[PDB]
Ligand binder design. Sequence first.
Ligand SMILES: *[C@@H]1O[C@H](CO)[C@@H](O[C@@H]2O[C@H](CO)[C@@H](O[C@@H]3O[C@H](CO[C@H]4O[C@H](CO)[C@@H](O)[C@H](O)[C@@H]4O)[C@@H](O)[C@H](O[C@H]4O[C@H](CO)[C@@H](O)[C@H](O)[C@@H]4O)[C@@H]3O)[C@H](O)[C@H]2NC(C)=O)[C@H](O)[C@H]1NC(C)=O
Ligand SMILES: *[C@@H]1O[C@H](CO)[C@@H](O[C@@H]2O[C@H](CO)[C@@H](O[C@@H]3O[C@H](CO[C@H]4O[C@H](CO)[C@@H](O)[C@H](O)[C@@H]4O)[C@@H](O)[C@H](O[C@H]4O[C@H](CO)[C@@H](O)[C@H](O)[C@@H]4O)[C@@H]3O)[C@H](O)[C@H]2NC(C)=O)[C@H](O)[C@H]1NC(C)=O
Ligand SMILES: *[C@@H]1O[C@H](CO)[C@@H](O[C@@H]2O[C@H](CO)[C@@H](O[C@@H]3O[C@H](CO[C@H]4O[C@H](CO)[C@@H](O)[C@H](O)[C@@H]4O)[C@@H](O)[C@H](O[C@H]4O[C@H](CO)[C@@H](O)[C@H](O)[C@@H]4O)[C@@H]3O)[C@H](O)[C@H]2NC(C)=O)[C@H](O)[C@H]1NC(C)=O
Ligand SMILES: *[C@@H]1O[C@H](CO)[C@@H](O[C@@H]2O[C@H](CO)[C@@H](O[C@@H]3O[C@H](CO)[C@@H](O)[C@H](O)[C@@H]3O)[C@H](O)[C@H]2NC(C)=O)[C@H](O)[C@H]1NC(C)=O
Ligand SMILES: *[C@@H]1O[C@H](CO)[C@@H](O[C@@H]2O[C@H](CO)[C@@H](O[C@@H]3O[C@H](CO)[C@@H](O)[C@H](O)[C@@H]3O)[C@H](O)[C@H]2NC(C)=O)[C@H](O)[C@H]1NC(C)=O
Ligand SMILES: *[C@@H]1O[C@H](CO)[C@@H](O[C@@H]2O[C@H](CO)[C@@H](O[C@@H]3O[C@H](CO)[C@@H](O)[C@H](O)[C@@H]3O)[C@H](O)[C@H]2NC(C)=O)[C@H](O)[C@H]1NC(C)=O
Ligand SMILES: *[C@@H]1O[C@H](CO)[C@@H](O[C@@H]2O[C@H](CO)[C@@H](O)[C@H](O)[C@H]2NC(C)=O)[C@H](O)[C@H]1NC(C)=O
Ligand SMILES: *[C@@H]1O[C@H](CO)[C@@H](O[C@@H]2O[C@H](CO)[C@@H](O)[C@H](O)[C@H]2NC(C)=O)[C@H](O)[C@H]1NC(C)=O
Ligand SMILES: *[C@@H]1O[C@H](CO)[C@@H](O[C@@H]2O[C@H](CO)[C@@H](O)[C@H](O)[C@H]2NC(C)=O)[C@H](O)[C@H]1NC(C)=O
Ligand SMILES: *[C@@H]1O[C@H](CO)[C@@H](O[C@@H]2O[C@H](CO)[C@@H](O)[C@H](O)[C@H]2NC(C)=O)[C@H](O)[C@H]1NC(C)=O
Ligand SMILES: *[C@@H]1O[C@H](CO)[C@@H](O[C@@H]2O[C@H](CO)[C@@H](O)[C@H](O)[C@H]2NC(C)=O)[C@H](O)[C@H]1NC(C)=O
Ligand SMILES: *[C@@H]1O[C@H](CO)[C@@H](O[C@@H]2O[C@H](CO)[C@@H](O)[C@H](O)[C@H]2NC(C)=O)[C@H](O)[C@H]1NC(C)=O
Ligand SMILES: CC(=O)N[C@H]1[C@H]([C@H](O)[C@H](O)CO)O[C@@](O)(C(=O)O)C[C@@H]1O
Ligand SMILES: CC(=O)N[C@H]1[C@H]([C@H](O)[C@H](O)CO)O[C@@](O)(C(=O)O)C[C@@H]1O
Ligand SMILES: CC(=O)N[C@H]1[C@H]([C@H](O)[C@H](O)CO)O[C@@](O)(C(=O)O)C[C@@H]1O
Ligand SMILES: *[C@@H]1O[C@H](CO)[C@@H](O)[C@H](O)[C@H]1NC(C)=O
Ligand SMILES: *[C@@H]1O[C@H](CO)[C@@H](O)[C@H](O)[C@H]1NC(C)=O
Ligand SMILES: *[C@@H]1O[C@H](CO)[C@@H](O)[C@H](O)[C@H]1NC(C)=O
Ligand SMILES: *[C@@H]1O[C@H](CO)[C@@H](O)[C@H](O)[C@H]1NC(C)=O
Ligand SMILES: *[C@@H]1O[C@H](CO)[C@@H](O)[C@H](O)[C@H]1NC(C)=O
Ligand SMILES: *[C@@H]1O[C@H](CO)[C@@H](O)[C@H](O)[C@H]1NC(C)=O
Ligand SMILES: *[C@@H]1O[C@H](CO)[C@@H](O)[C@H](O)[C@H]1NC(C)=O
Lengths: 317, 317, 317
Amino acid sequence: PGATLCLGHHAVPNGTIVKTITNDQIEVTNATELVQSSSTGGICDSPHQILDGENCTLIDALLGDPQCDGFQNKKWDLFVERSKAYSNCYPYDVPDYASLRSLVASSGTLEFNNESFNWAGVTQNGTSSACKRRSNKSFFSRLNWLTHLKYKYPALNVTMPNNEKFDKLYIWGVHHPVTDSEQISLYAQASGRITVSTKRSQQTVIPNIGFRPRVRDISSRISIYWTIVKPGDILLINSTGNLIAPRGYFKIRSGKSSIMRSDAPIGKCNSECITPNGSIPNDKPFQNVNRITYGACPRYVKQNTLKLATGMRNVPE
Amino acid sequence: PGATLCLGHHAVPNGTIVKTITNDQIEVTNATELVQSSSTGGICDSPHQILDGENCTLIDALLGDPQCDGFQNKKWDLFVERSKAYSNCYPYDVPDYASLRSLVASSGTLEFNNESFNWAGVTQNGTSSACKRRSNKSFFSRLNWLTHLKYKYPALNVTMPNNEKFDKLYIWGVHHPVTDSEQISLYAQASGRITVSTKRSQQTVIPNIGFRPRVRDISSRISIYWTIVKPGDILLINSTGNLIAPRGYFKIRSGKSSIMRSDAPIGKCNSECITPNGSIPNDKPFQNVNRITYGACPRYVKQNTLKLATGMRNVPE
Amino acid sequence: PGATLCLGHHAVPNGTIVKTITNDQIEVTNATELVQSSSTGGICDSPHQILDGENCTLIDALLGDPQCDGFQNKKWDLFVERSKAYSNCYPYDVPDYASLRSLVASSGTLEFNNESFNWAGVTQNGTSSACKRRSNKSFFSRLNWLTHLKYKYPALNVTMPNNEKFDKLYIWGVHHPVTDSEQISLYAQASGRITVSTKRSQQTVIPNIGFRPRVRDISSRISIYWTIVKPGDILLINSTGNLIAPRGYFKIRSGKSSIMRSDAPIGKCNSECITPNGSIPNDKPFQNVNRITYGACPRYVKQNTLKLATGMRNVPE
Ligand SMILES: *[C@@H]1O[C@H](CO)[C@@H](O[C@@H]2O[C@H](CO)[C@@H](O[C@@H]3O[C@H](CO[C@H]4O[C@H](CO)[C@@H](O)[C@H](O)[C@@H]4O)[C@@H](O)[C@H](O[C@H]4O[C@H](CO)[C@@H](O)[C@H](O)[C@@H]4O)[C@@H]3O)[C@H](O)[C@H]2NC(C)=O)[C@H](O)[C@H]1NC(C)=O
Ligand SMILES: *[C@@H]1O[C@H](CO)[C@@H](O[C@@H]2O[C@H](CO)[C@@H](O[C@@H]3O[C@H](CO[C@H]4O[C@H](CO)[C@@H](O)[C@H](O)[C@@H]4O)[C@@H](O)[C@H](O[C@H]4O[C@H](CO)[C@@H](O)[C@H](O)[C@@H]4O)[C@@H]3O)[C@H](O)[C@H]2NC(C)=O)[C@H](O)[C@H]1NC(C)=O
Ligand SMILES: *[C@@H]1O[C@H](CO)[C@@H](O[C@@H]2O[C@H](CO)[C@@H](O[C@@H]3O[C@H](CO[C@H]4O[C@H](CO)[C@@H](O)[C@H](O)[C@@H]4O)[C@@H](O)[C@H](O[C@H]4O[C@H](CO)[C@@H](O)[C@H](O)[C@@H]4O)[C@@H]3O)[C@H](O)[C@H]2NC(C)=O)[C@H](O)[C@H]1NC(C)=O
Ligand SMILES: *[C@@H]1O[C@H](CO)[C@@H](O[C@@H]2O[C@H](CO)[C@@H](O[C@@H]3O[C@H](CO)[C@@H](O)[C@H](O)[C@@H]3O)[C@H](O)[C@H]2NC(C)=O)[C@H](O)[C@H]1NC(C)=O
Ligand SMILES: *[C@@H]1O[C@H](CO)[C@@H](O[C@@H]2O[C@H](CO)[C@@H](O[C@@H]3O[C@H](CO)[C@@H](O)[C@H](O)[C@@H]3O)[C@H](O)[C@H]2NC(C)=O)[C@H](O)[C@H]1NC(C)=O
Ligand SMILES: *[C@@H]1O[C@H](CO)[C@@H](O[C@@H]2O[C@H](CO)[C@@H](O[C@@H]3O[C@H](CO)[C@@H](O)[C@H](O)[C@@H]3O)[C@H](O)[C@H]2NC(C)=O)[C@H](O)[C@H]1NC(C)=O
Ligand SMILES: *[C@@H]1O[C@H](CO)[C@@H](O[C@@H]2O[C@H](CO)[C@@H](O)[C@H](O)[C@H]2NC(C)=O)[C@H](O)[C@H]1NC(C)=O
Ligand SMILES: *[C@@H]1O[C@H](CO)[C@@H](O[C@@H]2O[C@H](CO)[C@@H](O)[C@H](O)[C@H]2NC(C)=O)[C@H](O)[C@H]1NC(C)=O
Ligand SMILES: *[C@@H]1O[C@H](CO)[C@@H](O[C@@H]2O[C@H](CO)[C@@H](O)[C@H](O)[C@H]2NC(C)=O)[C@H](O)[C@H]1NC(C)=O
Ligand SMILES: *[C@@H]1O[C@H](CO)[C@@H](O[C@@H]2O[C@H](CO)[C@@H](O)[C@H](O)[C@H]2NC(C)=O)[C@H](O)[C@H]1NC(C)=O
Ligand SMILES: *[C@@H]1O[C@H](CO)[C@@H](O[C@@H]2O[C@H](CO)[C@@H](O)[C@H](O)[C@H]2NC(C)=O)[C@H](O)[C@H]1NC(C)=O
Ligand SMILES: *[C@@H]1O[C@H](CO)[C@@H](O[C@@H]2O[C@H](CO)[C@@H](O)[C@H](O)[C@H]2NC(C)=O)[C@H](O)[C@H]1NC(C)=O
Ligand SMILES: CC(=O)N[C@H]1[C@H]([C@H](O)[C@H](O)CO)O[C@@](O)(C(=O)O)C[C@@H]1O
Ligand SMILES: CC(=O)N[C@H]1[C@H]([C@H](O)[C@H](O)CO)O[C@@](O)(C(=O)O)C[C@@H]1O
Ligand SMILES: CC(=O)N[C@H]1[C@H]([C@H](O)[C@H](O)CO)O[C@@](O)(C(=O)O)C[C@@H]1O
Ligand SMILES: *[C@@H]1O[C@H](CO)[C@@H](O)[C@H](O)[C@H]1NC(C)=O
Ligand SMILES: *[C@@H]1O[C@H](CO)[C@@H](O)[C@H](O)[C@H]1NC(C)=O
Ligand SMILES: *[C@@H]1O[C@H](CO)[C@@H](O)[C@H](O)[C@H]1NC(C)=O
Ligand SMILES: *[C@@H]1O[C@H](CO)[C@@H](O)[C@H](O)[C@H]1NC(C)=O
Ligand SMILES: *[C@@H]1O[C@H](CO)[C@@H](O)[C@H](O)[C@H]1NC(C)=O
Ligand SMILES: *[C@@H]1O[C@H](CO)[C@@H](O)[C@H](O)[C@H]1NC(C)=O
Ligand SMILES: *[C@@H]1O[C@H](CO)[C@@H](O)[C@H](O)[C@H]1NC(C)=O
């Protein structure tokens, strides 16, 4: 009689379909998904330091809009900008807005140090009804609106040395009056000119008198500029009118900080990978949630599923 | 005696050489080419909507050069710009030319809507001998050259609200006169200044009086600018001279439109993939015709041939 | 009795560990390194034409700083800029510095041809104590500082046609005086304006009077500009003051030239691949020395070692 001895292998009743080099559909005993396609829907507050902008853009928090005073000197790994944010101060623009937003976002700090600028012979601390704090007229917290003192605006020629070990970031501006009479009334002379320089760089800005459409009832504008001053260099501001003056400087750091546009709620939880849709797990190598990411994240791909076989071909009975 | 039974495989007298991981030259029974290396030499008019610029650059068709009146309000999937195209109107430049060309190309339409700007107190519709239509003096069709009315040019302070559901694109300009006397003669005052604003943006441009080399016998220049106005925003033009005024706005759309530089003839035929050399078949995954493509195209690679084996090793008798 | 015949394979006592698709550590009999991780520490002078900037940036060699006269008309495949380089002429800036540096670097030549500009009615060849040659006052060799002649500066309206077969690169500038009295004293009128044009392009620059921090005891500045003039086009310079005039043009070539920041010594040796750390051998496909390369170089990767098996699995006795 003898015996029979058969060699074989397992199979399962519920196999899974994968792709190969020779066949788009072959059933294997088991597989694992390599594309992360879902989010929790919230941004976990840990382990990255999250700063929710709430009503404030980063730039409004920088300048010191009245809704943004709670942001002073705060730091972040990720600043989260909300689509509902809006300005509630004097109407302004920033030539190169994207670059200023980016460099501050990347620096990851709003640390500000006041300095004693000698604004000899002018009126300081100008305010406006378009920028209220607690119903009083106010202005951007970090800027100083200078105007005539007894119908004189003597030329400004003011120095601030950087004897620090770090770079200083200065934010300053130019006021564009609506009319010639408004120019004379604020600055006591027909036009201004502003030259802000260091040993390595110079910027000159000319105010442009005229009507723009009213925003918070104001037809004039402020245009915002910035200047970085290296250790051992010197800031020189030379102006005859229209200067929106700095009150001091911001620290610039380098590191891992960034900014993200999202309306996802912030939650008490821990997740390394952030997207605008919310935090996502980062076990998988790929993800199709969002091209926009921050942290230790899977790589964005177009596929919504990629199954890796983790078993042999399934050959059911 | 018994029998003999031999196992074997086919071969061919005309095998083809392919590359592998271990050998740069191995003969197989058959192969297929993966790189498309030839074109028909013409651009097929189907299935993409092709617009041949002929004598006109896209920007000349936009502004309304006298050779380009047939382009009014036309749409395209691909605008084809010819190397022979040249301007035949007033000499101009466009700071950022590449960006204006790109954004119009991508929008894919020259749809234009006239609007009723109230140009109170000036002469409209200025023309020039450098921009003839049918031997008369003429000008860019979409622009309005304003000059003094009885030696006055009163300040312009003109509004145009966008109460549409779409964005509006405005094209406008500044005239740079050749001399101080030409400035006075056209605008009745020593200089102009132009500020074009919305609630979100502002641009001011200063005319620059002086000689440039003569082009179509003109030593002055026009410089072209643009402004996009969102729904619920308002265009404000404020100027004292030198304004080359808009006559209305262009629609801006988003979609699949582009622009290509080519001198290939347009033909009656159907091909999904367009290159500057002509349309190419798109069965192959790769191509070495041109890095510049439009449509469903193979991917550009440096290799001129890549043969994929489609049979076994060829082992001839 | 019979015989025994065993099939087998070699092994070695000193195998090497490699990575595979199924195992991060498997021992093979032999392997070869695919990542170049060391440099000689010097830049080999062959076979690329190397130009050591020494004390000179490329831009200082272009303009003609007093420390850079030995660079006149020199050509390079690779211009090597040293971190110790510093300027020793009139303090200047270049809006777009990076682009001018890049285009000259890529052109690979400082070939300069003097031209006879007719500067009618002004004093030529102005000099300064901030730009000495051999203790005399001097200036940038390739620039011509024009000032009043007997308290007149009549308007300049000067032409230079390009009747060559190649493009011409013109470098020119604007002087920004420290004060109104300095402006009058040099140019005999209250301000200048400079318009430099061709048939295709125009640039106008306004001098900006004011104090900048002293550099080599000078509080004024020069700002540098450039203009390319195609064959059959014409350069037109129109100015009433403050012009830092060209003396002629640079040839612009196209080819394989570039620029590299490095403090590595130049040596007498032959190596195709240059990095800032020094030349590296280029037998390997990859390297982790520097992302910055010039010549026939391995590709930069993050790994510091990648071992390719060149033998079978090692199975010791
Ligand atoms: C189909 O094929 C897949 C892939 O092979 C199988 O999925 C694996 O299943 C095993 C067993 O369930 C999983 O193992 C468990 O996950 C963790 C593994 O530890 C590593 O990964 C985690 C991430 O979760 C890291 O944080 C960690 O540092 C390790 O690198 C453990 O958390 C689990 O722990 C449990 O067992 C241990 C044993 O000591 C205990 O300490 C704990 O109490 C706990 O109960 C466990 O080890 C593995 O994660 C799965 N991989 C994937 C990719 O999903 C399927 O099982 C298979 N299906 C079938 C039917 O065969
Ligand atoms: C060497 O190796 C190559 C690659 O395997 C072989 O080339 C193939 O040859 C076959 C047979 O000639 C070709 O088949 C023909 O092409 C079309 C295939 O249909 C698909 O592809 C077309 C693109 O052309 C798509 O539009 C379509 O939707 C399909 O996805 C058909 O158009 C042809 O149709 C003919 O036969 C059918 C049969 O029903 C009829 O309906 C028609 O009347 C018509 O006569 C046909 O099927 C195939 O395209 C070739 N592939 C490639 C990549 O070239 C060589 O044959 C082989 N050489 C040797 C000597 O063995
Ligand atoms: C472990 O595995 C590695 C990889 O297989 C082996 O390394 C190879 O070893 C051989 C033998 O020593 C090396 O061969 C020598 O290198 C040159 C080969 O010529 C080509 O490559 C050079 C670059 O060096 C090119 O310039 C040239 O154009 C060729 O493309 C030759 O320079 C050497 O020449 C010597 O022998 C010839 C024989 O005719 C003579 O003319 C000369 O006099 C001279 O003495 C020689 O051919 C090969 O380069 C190595 N490759 C690598 C990648 O390192 C190890 O040998 C192996 N180890 C063990 C223990 O098995
Ligand atoms: C130049 O043109 C602009 C734009 O048309 C003019 O601005 C407009 O000025 C009027 C008159 O002051 C503004 O009216 C105000 O509206 C508010 C809002 O309801 C109201 O509270 C005030 O009582 C007043 O009615 C109008 O808002 C403003 N329009 C825009 C778009 O800004 C400007 O007056 C013109 N200048 C001259 C000198 O003509
Ligand atoms: C400032 O410099 C420019 C450039 O040299 C001068 O422009 C030149 O002006 C002359 C005189 O009008 C032009 O001559 C004309 O040439 C045409 C072409 O054949 C001809 O049809 C006319 O009858 C006349 O001869 C010349 O073309 C022009 N050159 C360029 C390059 O534009 C300008 O005159 C100077 N201005 C002053 C005030 O000196
Ligand atoms: C406008 O503000 C600037 C900056 O404070 C003033 O520039 C400064 O001018 C003084 C007076 O000439 C310079 O002093 C000089 O220092 C050198 C260096 O040791 C020395 O050799 C001279 O004898 C003299 O003491 C000073 O260097 C300079 N500072 C900077 C940062 O450039 C300028 O004077 C002010 N202008 C007016 C009209 O007030
Ligand atoms: C640069 O700063 C200087 C120093 O105050 C200014 O020059 C003075 O300007 C006033 C008013 O215009 C004149 O009365 C003085 O005679 C000037 N002094 C000197 C030494 O020239 C100058 O106006 C400043 N520039 C700008 C753009 O504000
Ligand atoms: C995560 O959010 C992104 C961003 O909105 C979503 O991507 C958009 O998906 C819609 C379809 O609902 C498309 O119309 C848009 O093209 C996508 N937006 C952009 C800006 O490209 C995505 O659906 C979300 N993913 C998950 C898993 O929630
Ligand atoms: C901005 O528009 C206003 C409104 O017309 C202009 O201001 C007037 O300018 C004229 C002529 O220069 C003066 O006579 C009026 O007194 C001004 N009116 C007011 C209310 O100030 C102004 O010129 C325009 N700006 C530009 C750059 O064109
Ligand atoms: C398609 O057109 C391109 C564009 O001109 C051709 O590529 C050029 O080829 C010439 C050789 O005749 C080279 O000198 C140039 O470097 C290429 N041009 C550019 C701009 O890089 C190409 O030969 C054409 N291909 C086919 C298949 O017709
Ligand atoms: C452009 O060049 C012309 C030609 O010299 C200059 O125009 C002359 O300017 C002088 C002095 O300002 C006047 O006296 C003449 O009447 C002008 N001539 C003409 C024909 O207008 C003009 O100043 C130059 N522009 C610049 C910016 O320098
Ligand atoms: C070649 O030079 C580069 C450039 O400095 C070196 O890379 C730097 O390595 C240091 C560590 O000593 C890091 O802190 C820096 O991040 C690197 N620099 C930059 C600018 O990224 C590199 O070490 C050198 N490699 C060799 C083989 O000598
Ligand atoms: C510093 C100063 O003088 N501020 C005044 C401003 C400016 O004159 C204009 O805003 C300039 O355009 O105007 C107000 O109507 C305002 O904005 O509230 C009153 C305010 O006191
Ligand atoms: C609107 C207007 O006044 N147009 C006139 C222009 C301008 O004066 C200059 O072109 C400005 O530079 O000059 C002409 O010689 C021309 O170009 O044909 C006559 C023409 O009637
Ligand atoms: C051409 C000319 O007039 N050069 C003079 C300059 C300029 O007046 C200023 O540098 C302009 O800012 O000033 C000097 O002190 C200098 O720099 O050496 C004296 C020099 O002879
Ligand atoms: C098959 O069934 C087992 C037991 O219910 C389960 O654990 C396994 O994961 C199932 N299917 C797939 C596709 O993973
Ligand atoms: C933000 O603004 C809205 C009004 O637009 C208000 O309801 C909300 O309380 C504000 N929150 C903060 C923190 O300023
Ligand atoms: C070999 O010959 C056959 C018949 O002539 C042909 O169809 C085949 O495609 C030939 N060669 C190659 C390289 O394809
Ligand atoms: C285009 O311009 C050339 C002259 O340069 C002319 O021959 C041709 O007829 C013109 N065609 C059109 C459509 O304007
Ligand atoms: C092993 O030893 C031989 C002879 O000493 C040597 O040539 C070989 O390269 C050695 N090891 C490795 C890791 O290459
Ligand atoms: C470069 O400058 C330094 C002084 O900073 C000097 O020692 C050296 O000799 C100079 N060399 C040349 C070639 O100018
Ligand atoms: C200017 O200097 C050059 C030498 O650099 C000389 O040829 C020329 O004659 C000088 N011109 C004047 C007007 O001084």
